């Protein structure tokens, strides 16, 4: 019965994030000489050009990490990341201007990605 003012008593268990959405694991490599850190909610295909990965696999997806956290890529670093599906209307506007509409238009997204030099358009 020591009193900590305003303390929590959290209930038992765990919180599952992004429940019921498809998950995907891909390899990603920072081919640049400066660090890149990627947030939980950026449309993954639209991340920095010097990150190399299967760009098709990033379409309509984002990192499967707690909201507000990030994945860090040191210069030259290759690692696996897990992706989850975008929700809501599944539309993306702005960012890198690769989508600007439905995420379903994978052909057009990839064509823009290739022309602008985003690495890993296979």
């Amino acid at each position: 019965n020591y009193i900590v003012p305003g303390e929590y008593r959290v209930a038992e268990g765990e919180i599952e994030i992004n429940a019921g959405r498809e998950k995907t694991t891909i390899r990603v490599s920072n081919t640049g000489d400066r660090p890149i850190q990627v947030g939980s909610h950026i449309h993954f295909v639209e991340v920095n050009k010097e990150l190399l990965f299967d760009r098709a696999e990033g379409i309509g997806r984002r990192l499967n990490i707690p909201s507000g956290t990030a994945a860090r890529f040191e210069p030259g670093e290759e690692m696996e990341v897990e992706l989850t599906e975008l929700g809501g209307n599944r539309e993306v506007f702005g960012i890198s201007d690769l989508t600007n509409g439905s995420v379903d238009n994978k052909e057009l997204i990839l064509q823009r990605a290739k022309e602008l030099g985003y690495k890993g358009v296979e």
Binding site: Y2, P5, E7
Partner: protein, 100 residues
């Protein structure tokens, strides 16, 4: 004197610290605002003495112990921050969990 707005305000901290130190001297366990006032004034006076930010980051953690304060006070104070004029200008000092 040419007191600016900050100088006016920070005199209050010194005053609160004096009040709190008197209360400690007569054997009272210190509360939240008293504890904060003591550590803050310590930091500002340390900067006036010409100590470094690094020294004050260390020392700030040994100004008050848990037997100096009321129940719950150590857990209420996450960090204490103060800006003062060091010999090389104004600098921010942060002391993390000052009361262990």
């Amino acid at each position: 004197m040419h007191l600016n707005p900050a100088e006016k305000e920070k005199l209050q901290i010194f005053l609160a610290s004096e009040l709190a130190l008197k209360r400690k001297a007569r054997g009272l366990k210190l509360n939240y605002p008293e504890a904060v006032a003591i550590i803050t004034s310590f930091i500002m006076e340390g900067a006036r003495d010409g100590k470094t930010v690094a020294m004050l980051m260390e020392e700030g953690k040994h100004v008050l112990t848990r037997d100096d304060v009321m129940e719950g006070v150590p857990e209420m104070i996450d960090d204490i921050q103060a800006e003062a004029t060091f010999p090389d200008g104004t600098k921010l000092v942060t002391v993390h969990n000052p009361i262990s």
